[PDB]
């Protein structure tokens, strides 16, 4: 996260760290959607251009974290993966279309003050909140700059940008399975997700029922926090039917 702030304790209790067993490092962000299911970006697990192809046994999910590096004894819970599920039509070749993956935990995670699942939007929640100008929140332990590493979880609030403005900011082809967010150069305010933030959630707080909904997944960008550029997110509601199918097994 570039131009964000340190998160408050328990501010994002669905925040998940995808952790590589060897070498011991940060792989990606992710989110807790139930006691047994974790949502991430498919590119965190499968990305042939960079020789990325992780199997269940290659990583761990670390839930309830705040500090990036320290083992948070009596706070975080570390879980092993039973099974990975990548969207069958995930497009890593061109534009990261349908950049979504589900991960089943070996054992259910126990909820606490620091561990709690985020809601997934229904059709109406998605229609009422996914509007240009409406702000969402992105969290992660990713790069503080495009070319620093934070001590604690970072947070940034960013407005959803109009589809023509997203389309006009890049040469990459944009689909209905993605949206873009961030400030324009005229707005003054800054902020963006960056490398290491991938797979993390873009959330919004419903003004109707006061619950937090995950509307997006950190997917891609071209650089980080560049003027006239925007961060791209997987549109969660557009792929909810695949999500429901995998969970219903």
């Amino acid at each position: 996260i570039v131009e964000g702030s340190d998160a408050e304790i328990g501010m994002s209790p669905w925040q998940v760290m995808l952790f590589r067993k060897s070498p011991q490092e940060l792989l990606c962000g992710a989110s807790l959607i139930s006691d047994r299911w974790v949502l991430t970006a498919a590119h965190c697990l499968l990305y042939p251009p960079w020789d990325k192809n992780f199997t269940e046994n290659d990583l761990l999910v670390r839930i309830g974290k705040h500090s990036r590096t320290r083992y948070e004894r009596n706070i975080e819970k570390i879980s092993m993966l039973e099974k990975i599920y990548i969207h069958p039509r995930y497009n890593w070749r061109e534009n990261l279309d349908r950049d979504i993956a589900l991960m089943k935990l070996k054992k259910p995670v126990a909820f606490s003050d620091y561990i709690h699942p985020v809601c997934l939007p229904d059709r109406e929640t998605a229609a009422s909140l996914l509007q240009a100008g409406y702000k969402g929140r992105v969290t992660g332990w990713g790069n503080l700059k495009e070319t620093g590493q934070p001590s604690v979880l970072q947070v940034v609030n960013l407005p959803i940008v109009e589809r023509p403005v997203c389309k006009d900011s890049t040469r990459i082809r944009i689909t209905d399975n993605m949206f873009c967010a961030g400030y324009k150069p005229d707005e003054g305010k800054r902020g963006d997700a960056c490398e290491g933030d991938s797979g993390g959630p873009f959330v919004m707080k419903s003004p109707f029922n006061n619950r937090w909904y995950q509307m997006g997944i950190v997917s891609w960008g071209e650089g980080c926090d560049r003027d006239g550029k925007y961060g791209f997110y997987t549109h969660v509601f557009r792929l909810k039917k695949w999500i429901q199918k995998v969970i219903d097994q």
């Binding site: 067993k21 490092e25 590096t69 083992y71």
Partner: peptide, 10 residues
């Protein structure tokens, strides 16, 4: 620069 995690998690 990541702190060692308990052996129990493999």
């Amino acid at each position: 620069d990541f702190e060692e995690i308990p052996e129990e998690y493999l």
